[PDB]
Amino acid sequence: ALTEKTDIFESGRNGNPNKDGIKSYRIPALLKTDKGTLIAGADERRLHSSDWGDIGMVIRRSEDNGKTWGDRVTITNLRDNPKASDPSIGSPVNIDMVLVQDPETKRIFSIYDMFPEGKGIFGMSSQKEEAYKKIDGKTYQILYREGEKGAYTIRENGTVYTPDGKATDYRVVVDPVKPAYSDKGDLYKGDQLLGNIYFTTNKTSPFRIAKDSYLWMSYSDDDGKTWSAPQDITPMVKADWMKFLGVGPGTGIVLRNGPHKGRILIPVYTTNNVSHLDGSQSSRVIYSDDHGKTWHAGEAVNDNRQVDGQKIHSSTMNNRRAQNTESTVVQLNNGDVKLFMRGLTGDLQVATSKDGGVTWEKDIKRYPQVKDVYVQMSAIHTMHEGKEYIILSNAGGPKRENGMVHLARVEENGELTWLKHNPIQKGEFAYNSLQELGNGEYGILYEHTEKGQNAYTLSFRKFNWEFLSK
Amino acid sequence: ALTEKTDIFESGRNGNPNKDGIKSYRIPALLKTDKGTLIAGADERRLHSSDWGDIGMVIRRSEDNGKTWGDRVTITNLRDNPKASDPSIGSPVNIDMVLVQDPETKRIFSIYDMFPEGKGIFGMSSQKEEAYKKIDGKTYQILYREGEKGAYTIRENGTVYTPDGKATDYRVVVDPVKPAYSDKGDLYKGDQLLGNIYFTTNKTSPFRIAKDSYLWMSYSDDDGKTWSAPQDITPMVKADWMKFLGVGPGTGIVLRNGPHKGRILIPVYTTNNVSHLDGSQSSRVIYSDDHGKTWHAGEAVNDNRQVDGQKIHSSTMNNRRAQNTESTVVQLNNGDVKLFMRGLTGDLQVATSKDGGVTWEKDIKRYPQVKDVYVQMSAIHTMHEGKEYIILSNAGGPKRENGMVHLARVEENGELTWLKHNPIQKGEFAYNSLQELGNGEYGILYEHTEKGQNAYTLSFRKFNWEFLSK
Ligand SMILES: CCC(CC)O[C@@H]1C=C(C(=O)O)C[C@H](N)[C@H]1NC(C)=O
Ligand SMILES: CCC(CC)O[C@@H]1C=C(C(=O)O)C[C@H](N)[C@H]1NC(C)=O
Ligand SMILES: [Cl-]
Ligand SMILES: [Cl-]
Numbered sequence: 032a033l034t035e036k037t038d039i040f041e042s043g044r045n046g047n048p049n050k051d052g053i054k055s056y057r058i059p060a061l062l063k064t065d066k067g068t069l070i071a072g073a074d075e076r077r078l079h080s081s082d083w084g085d086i087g088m089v090i091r092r093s094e095d096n097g098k099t100w101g102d103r104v105t106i107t108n109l110r111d112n113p114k115a116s117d118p119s120i121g122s123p124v125n126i127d128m129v130l131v132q133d134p135e136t137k138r139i140f141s142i143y144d145m146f147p148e149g150k151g152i153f154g155m156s157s158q159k160e161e162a163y164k165k166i167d168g169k170t171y172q173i174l175y176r177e178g179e180k181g182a183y184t185i186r187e188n189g190t191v192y193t194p195d196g197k198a199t200d201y202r203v204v205v206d207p208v209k210p211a212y213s214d215k216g217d218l219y220k221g222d223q224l225l226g227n228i229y230f231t232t233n234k235t236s237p238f239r240i241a242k243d244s245y246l247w248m249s250y251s252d253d254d255g256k257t258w259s260a261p262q263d264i265t266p267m268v269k270a271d272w273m274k275f276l277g278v279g280p281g282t283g284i285v286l287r288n289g290p291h292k293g294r295i296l297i298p299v300y301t302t303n304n305v306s307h308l309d310g311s312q313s314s315r316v317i318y319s320d321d322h323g324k325t326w327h328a329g330e331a332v333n334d335n336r337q338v339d340g341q342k343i344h345s346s347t348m349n350n351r352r353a354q355n356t357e358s359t360v361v362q363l364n365n366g367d368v369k370l371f372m373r374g375l376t377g378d379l380q381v382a383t384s385k386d387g388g389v390t391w392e393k394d395i396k397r398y399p400q401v402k403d404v405y406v407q408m409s410a411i412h413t414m415h416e417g418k419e420y421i422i423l424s425n426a427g428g429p430k431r432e433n434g435m436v437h438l439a440r441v442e443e444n445g446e447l448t449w450l451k452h453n454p455i456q457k458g459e460f461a462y463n464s465l466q467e468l469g470n471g472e473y474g475i476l477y478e479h480t481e482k483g484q485n486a487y488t489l490s491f492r493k494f495n496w497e498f499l500s501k
Numbered sequence: 502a503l504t505e506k507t508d509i510f511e512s513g514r515n516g517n518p519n520k521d522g523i524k525s526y527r528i529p530a531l532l533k534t535d536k537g538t539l540i541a542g543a544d545e546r547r548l549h550s551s552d553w554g555d556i557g558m559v560i561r562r563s564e565d566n567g568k569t570w571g572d573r574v575t576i577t578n579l580r581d582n583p584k585a586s587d588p589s590i591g592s593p594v595n596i597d598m599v600l601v602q603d604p605e606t607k608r609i610f611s612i613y614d615m616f617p618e619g620k621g622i623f624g625m626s627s628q629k630e631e632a633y634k635k636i637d638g639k640t641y642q643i644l645y646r647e648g649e650k651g652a653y654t655i656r657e658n659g660t661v662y663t664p665d666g667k668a669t670d671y672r673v674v675v676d677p678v679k680p681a682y683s684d685k686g687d688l689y690k691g692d693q694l695l696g697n698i699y700f701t702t703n704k705t706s707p708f709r710i711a712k713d714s715y716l717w718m719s720y721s722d723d724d725g726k727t728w729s730a731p732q733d734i735t736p737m738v739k740a741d742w743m744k745f746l747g748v749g750p751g752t753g754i755v756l757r758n759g760p761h762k763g764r765i766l767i768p769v770y771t772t773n774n775v776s777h778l779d780g781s782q783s784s785r786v787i788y789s790d791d792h793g794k795t796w797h798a799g800e801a802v803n804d805n806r807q808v809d810g811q812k813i814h815s816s817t818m819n820n821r822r823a824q825n826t827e828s829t830v831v832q833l834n835n836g837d838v839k840l841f842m843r844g845l846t847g848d849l850q851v852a853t854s855k856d857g858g859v860t861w862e863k864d865i866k867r868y869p870q871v872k873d874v875y876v877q878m879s880a881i882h883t884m885h886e887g888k889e890y891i892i893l894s895n896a897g898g899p900k901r902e903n904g905m906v907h908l909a910r911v912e913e914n915g916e917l918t919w920l921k922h923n924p925i926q927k928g929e930f931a932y933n934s935l936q937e938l939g940n941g942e943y944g945i946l947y948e949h950t951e952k953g954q955n956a957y958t959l960s961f962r963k964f965n966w967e968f969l970s971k
Contacts, residue, residue, distance in 0.1 A: 159814040160805070180805050180863040194860070271816065272742035272774070304742075304817045305774050335630070335650050344629035346741065347774045386665070393650045 032498040033455065039091055039100060039476060040073045040489040047485075048077075055080035058280045058407075059489045061464035061476040062130040062255075065137050069093040069466070070255045071100070071476050072128050072141060073489050075108075078119055080486040083151030085111050085122040087211060088143055092255050097474055097491050106141055106249045106258045108211035112148050114233035120150045123216065123229035125247065129297050131283035136322050138250050142264070142297050144277040145245040147229040152244065152275055152308075154231070159274075159304065160241035163266045166196070170266045174203075174228060174238040183238060185228075191218075191238065201238065203228055212260050216240075244275045246299070250323065268299075268317045268328040272346045275302040279314065279357035279373075281409045281464045289366030291387030295319045296368065298358040301331065306349035313345035314355040314372045316388040332370065332382040332391045355380060355395070359410045360388070364419055367445050371410050371423060379403050379423075383445070400449035401437050404428045407462040413473070415496060421447060422499065424463045424475055427454065434460035434477060438499050453501050455494070461487060471496045502968040503925065509561060509570060509946060510543045510959040517955075518547075525550035528750045529946040529959045531879075531934035532600040532725075535607055539563040539936070540725040541570070541946050542598050542611060543959050545578075548589055550956040553621030555581050555592040557681060558613055560600075562725050567944050567961050576611055576719045576728045578681035582618050584703035590620045593686070593699035595717065599767050601753035606792045608720050611728070612767050614747040615715040617699040622714065622745055622778075624701070629774065630711035633736045636666070640736045644673075644698060644708040653708060655698075661708065671708070673698055682730050686710075714745045716769070720793065737796040738769075738787045742816045745772040749784065749827035749843075751879045751934045759836035761857030765789045768828040768840070771801065776819035783815035784825040784842045786858040802840065802852040802861045825850060825865075829880045830858070834889050837915040841880050841893060849873050849893075853915065870919040871907050874898040877932040882911075885941065885966060891917060892969065894933045894945055897924065904930035904947060908969050921969060931957060941966040 040056035043049040055076035062070040075087040087108035091100045107125050115121025128143040146154055163170050164182055171184040174191060181194030189205035190198050200221050207215035216229040218236040226236025246268065247261040269276045279298030286294045296316045303311040313333040317326050331345035338353045355372035362368050368384040370391070379401035383392045401423065408425035419441040427433035434456030439447040456479050463477035472495050478487035510526035513519040525546035532540040545557040557578035561570045577595055585591030598613040616624055633640050634652055641654040644661060651664025659675040660668055670690050677685035686699045688706040696706025716738065717731040739746045749768030756764045766786045773781040783803040789796050801815035808823045825842035832838050838854040840861070849871035853862045871893065878895035889911045897903035904926035909917040926949050933947035942965050948957035 156812075157817075158812050159817040160812075161814070180807075181860065182805075195856070270741045272740075303774070342626075342628050342630075344631075347627075347629040390651065390664070 032495055034493045036456070036479070036490040036492050037097065038488050038490045039071045040075070040089075042480070042485040042488045044485065045483040053077050055485050055487065056489050057462070057478065057487055058127050059462055059464045059476040059478060060128050060130040060141075060280060060282050061466045061474060062132060062139065062282050063466045063468060063474070064132055064139065064254055065134065066254050067094075067096070068254050069097050069474065070130060070139065071489070071491065072130050074126050074128070075103070075105070081119075081151075082126050083124045083146070083149070083154070084119050086124055086126055088125050088128055088141060088249070090141070090255055096468055096472075097493055104255065104258070105211040107143075107247070107261050108213055109215060109229060110213040110227070112227070112230040112232065114235065115148065116233065120154070121148065123148050123227070124151045126151060127278050127280040129278045129280055129283045131285065131295055131297065133295060133322050134285055135293060138252055138323060139255055140248055140250050140295070140323055141258070142246060142248045142278055142283075145247045145261075147240050147242055148231040149242065152277070154242060155244055155274065156242040160243060162241035162243045162245070172263070173241055175241070176237045177234070207260050215261060244269075244277060246276060246278070248323070264326050267326040270328065270346070272303055273301045274304050274307055276300075279359065280407060280462065281359055282466065284360055284362060286362050286368070286387055288362065288364065289387065291320075293320070294387050295323060296360050296388050298360050298370070300356050300358070301345055303346050303348065305347055310349035310351050310354065311345065312354040312356045313348070314358040314370060314382070315345070316360060316370070318388055329384075329389045330391065332372065332395065336395075337393065351375065355382075357407045359408055359423075361410050361412045361421055363412070363441055363445055365445055369410075369421070369447075371408060373405060373407055374403060375405060377403060381447070396447075398447065398449060401425070401452070402428045404430060406431050409463050409465045411465045411467060411473075413467055415471075422465055422473060424455065424465050424477070426460050431461045432459055433457060434463070434479070436475070436494070436499065451499060451501065453498060455492060459487070468493065502965055504567075504963045506926070506949070506960040506962050507567065508958055508960050509541050510545070510559075512950070512955040512958045514955065515953040523547050525955050525957065526959050527948065527957055528597050528932055529934045529948060530598050530600040530751050531936045531944060531946040532602060532609065532752055533936040533938060533944070534602055534609065534724055535604065536724050537564075537566070538724050539567055539944060540600060540609070541959070541961065542600055544596050544598075545573075545575075551621070552596050553594050553616070553619070553624070554589050556595055558595050558598055558611065558719070560611075560725055566938055566942075567963055574726065574728070575681040577613075577717070577731050578683055579685060579699060580683040580697065582697070582700040582702065584700075584705065585618065586703065590624070591618065593618050593697070594621045596621060597748050597750040599748045599750055599753045601755065601765055601767065603765060603792050604755055605763065608722055608793060609725055610718055610720050610753075610765070610793055612716060612718045612734070612748055612753075615717045615731070617710050617712055618701040619712065622747070624712060625714060625744065626712040630713060632711035632713045632715070642733070643711055645711070646707045647704070677730050685731060714739075714747060716746060716748070718793070734796050738798040740798070740816075742773060743771045744774050744777055746770075749829065750877060750932065751829055752936065754830055754832060756832050756838070756857055758832070758834065759857065761790070763790065764857050765793055766830045766838070766858050768830050770826050770828070771815055773816050773818070775817055780819035780821050780824065781815065782824040782826045783818070784828040784840060784852070785815070786830060786840070788858055799854070799859045800861065802842065802865065804861075806865070807863060821845065825852075827877045829878055829893075831880050831882050831891055833882070833911055833915050835913065835915055839891075839915070839917075841878060843875060843877055844873060845875060847873060851917070868917065868919060870922070871895070872898045874901060876901055879933050879935045881935045881937055883937055883943070892935055892943060894925065894935050894947070896930050901931045902929055903927060904933065904949070906945070906964065906969065921971065923968060923971070925962065925964070929957075938963065943969075
């Protein structure tokens with residue numbers, strides 16, 4: 032009914048790197064593809080377990096439903112700043128992926144955060160630094176030159192233009208070609224490599240991007256074997272007021288029914304400049320109606336939400352307990368979208384959208400039946416014997432421990448009834464990602480440690496309906 | 502050399518209404534047209550002197566250079582909410598105008614603030630209420646309905662659409678026809694008047710606009726005699742992060758030389774949601790390059806500005822002393838644009854733009870020769886014999902008192918050499934607006950009180966080069 036665990040990404044032990052030189056893996060995503068392949072994605076956290084440093088976005092593939100797994104494939108690994116004083120914060124950063132496959136095109140997307148060199152989200156400037164400029168209708172990423180106020184721009188072919196609109200002999204590698212695209216952002220003056228636009232300290236080149244928060248996408252058209260260069264989708268979805276915008280990691284969905292069938296939904300969340308991480312973390316989705324070419328931001332759950340008899344908005348709120356952060360998204364057979372959101376009530380919080388994830392109903396539903404210890408979760412739709420269910424996995428508590436799989440019946444009015452709660456992993460348990468495998472089987476990729484393992488080793492189990500019904 | 506004062510807009514006395522039932526006039530704008538007409542504009546503040554209540558945007562014309570003045574012409578006067586409990590905050594508000602004429606098309610523009618019913622800027626919602634939505638490429642104003650979360654929209658012909666995009670039987674007066682356009686915003690169902698979308702208390706209709714900050718424009722093609730219905734320019738210029746966006750009142754300019762010649766410049770300022778009126782007031786200009794058809798926001802003087810060794814941005818700043826508010830704008834013969842900004846240094850603060858008002862140099866210049874008591878000022882370019890000068894008028898201080906006219910030589914690099922400082926009005930003295938009359942003559946419209954006049958009576962004096970020079 033429940034398989035023994037298979038370690039997919041193994042961390043080092045007792046604070047040492049593993050044999051591949053990697054201290055930590057974090058942030059699992061699991062995707063069953065049209066070919067039946069399982070793709071397991073993770074942050075490869077080389078130097079330490081924190082949300083910054085030298086991190087690669089990686090996947091492994093299983094062609095036998097999780098029994099065996101191929102070599103690590105690295106999607107993106109930006110090169111470190113070789114002159115950084117603190118290597119622990121010395122690299123441009125990618126973290127936190129969401130995987131999804133388009134069922135019409137078979138294109139597989141990995142969407143993940145990016146920050147320039149520094150302490151990840153904690154490296155963002157304290158005052159806003161504009162990251163893009165719209166010039167004659169085209170959006171260009173901004174560069175700042177040492178000692179100068181003005182916004183240089185990266186235009187076609189990566190040619191750097193002066194704030195006054197004059198082409199220079201500086202060029203940015205906008206079409207990276209090295210393994211894992213480690214050359215992305217490299218800055219050249221003609222033939223000479225000078226540095227990298229993502230470096231923020233001890234620079235050898237004149238130019239850097241804004242110390243802001245970015246969203247990148249990479250895609251695979253060969254079942255996860257090879258991956259595109261990263262696409263910068265930030266300007267499509269990030270409003271000027273947003274401070275952080277980043278993914279709720281795991282596995283997104285494509286709507287399978289209703290007027291918005293085919294729409295791809297990716298959980299994200301934002302902060303504002305009023306209260307940032309103290310009081311404004313707010314869930315929403317971004318979405319594509321054209322198979323991943325263009326993206327749009329849905330409204331926040333928190334936009335025009337009534338909290339304590341007063342309205343809030345994600346752009347202006349400052350309310351610690353009204354926050355909702357990383358989320359997981361499911362569509363019901365009736366077309367409604369449920370967003371299960373990490374939050375600070377101690378129990379499961381759920382928002383509902385009747386318009387394919389663009390706007391949210393006025394009430395967030397809470398379920399005391401399911402504890403939320405403030406950690407990521409995953410949830411998936413499933414049918415069992417003509418009946419509709421949702422399976423949700425997260426930590427049982429009291430801390431990030433005792434992995435649970437929760438089973439809810441989806442009632443005829445779209446409400447949820449929690450029926451079963453079963454342990455899947457004793458001891459440490461954090462982030463996780465669920466997938467249906469077919470024939471009454473489900474798979475999960477999750478964070479756990481034992482035997483001195485560093486946070487975390489990402490392991491895989493399969494379970495069936497008999498496990499769920501216990 | 503200096504005429505006696507002529508009262509153009511007369512306030513009441515000792516706290517009472519004047520003979521027309523108007524307590525106060527405020528916020529002068531003076532415009533010398535191509536025909537030679539003088540247009541004097543003001544807020545007609547019926548109920549009291551504050552920046553809210555029942556206020557009309559008015560002008561008077563003089564066809565003989567300030568000797569005689571015609572009847573008051575009301576550009577815009579939104580109707581009050583007849584059901585408001587407190588009539589002093591009981592009307593949708595317009596306040597603060599900027600006048601300018603396009604020298605090519607001769608069209609005259611009046612641009613001014615608008616707020617829905619309440620205490621003016623102090624009636625803005627504490628949390629963001631979205632004011633506009635883009636649907637099918639088109640931008641629509643939002644309406645909120647009592648007890649409903651979703652955004653209704655005002656679409657073609659004023660027809661109200663549901664949040665889910667269905668036409669209702671409700672309609673908004675979007676093309677007002679009553680004198681002074683007092684029917685603007687009226688909410689009808691079929692042919693029955695139900696209320697007004699600008700009303701925010703004790704409503705008789707289901708709908709209101711966002712409690713936000715707006716910018717409206719009215720224009721005249723007949724030398725100020727008649728005026729168009731108000732045009733909502735807000736969505737063209739107001740970023741999502743901006744809380745307040747309003748004009749720096751007085752008289753705007755059209756650039757007369759350089760690559761941007763023809764551009765109309767209107768001083769405005771913003772606040773953000775981080776510190777609002779406490780630490781974020783920030784000057785900039787909005788501009789039109791197509792004779793007032795479309796408008797764009799320039800960058801703030803405060804954007805990426807270095808203050809006490811650290812950068813600020815207008816969208817995130819919280820620095821009382823770094824604020825700059827209402828301003829007056831002048832183009833030099835060398836093409837530079839100077840922005841003289843009301844601020845909190847006690848002396849004259851000046852920003853410079855080399856690109857027609859879009860971006861500003863890193864340093865704000867302070868001129869200790871000119872006191873600034875934290876009050877609006879006006880400034881104009883002038884040629885005399887034929888050397889280039891600026892004339893600037895404000896209060897000499899210590900309070901809002903002792904009107905001064907300041908004369909600067911503009912040097913070839915755009916530096917200002919202050920030559921003369923001449924008193925023009927003893928006693929109370931506040932907002933003002935200068936114009937060149939020709940033949941070495943200049944006219945000014947300013948706020949002053951005497952003999953128990955309520956703030957303010959707006960008066961007009963002419964002076965010549967003889968007065969300026971001693
Ligand atoms: C930014 C929100 C939160 C602050 C504690 O950090 C998240 C928490 C995490 C966690 O609770 O384990 C891991 C996430 N990968 C991280 N995200 C980022 C962007 O760093
Ligand atoms: C909003 C800035 C300030 C409040 C501190 O109010 C301004 C001050 C004024 C003043 O100092 O006399 C008059 C302006 N008409 C007013 N503007 C608005 C929009 O109300
Ligand atoms: Cl560099
Ligand atoms: Cl009403």
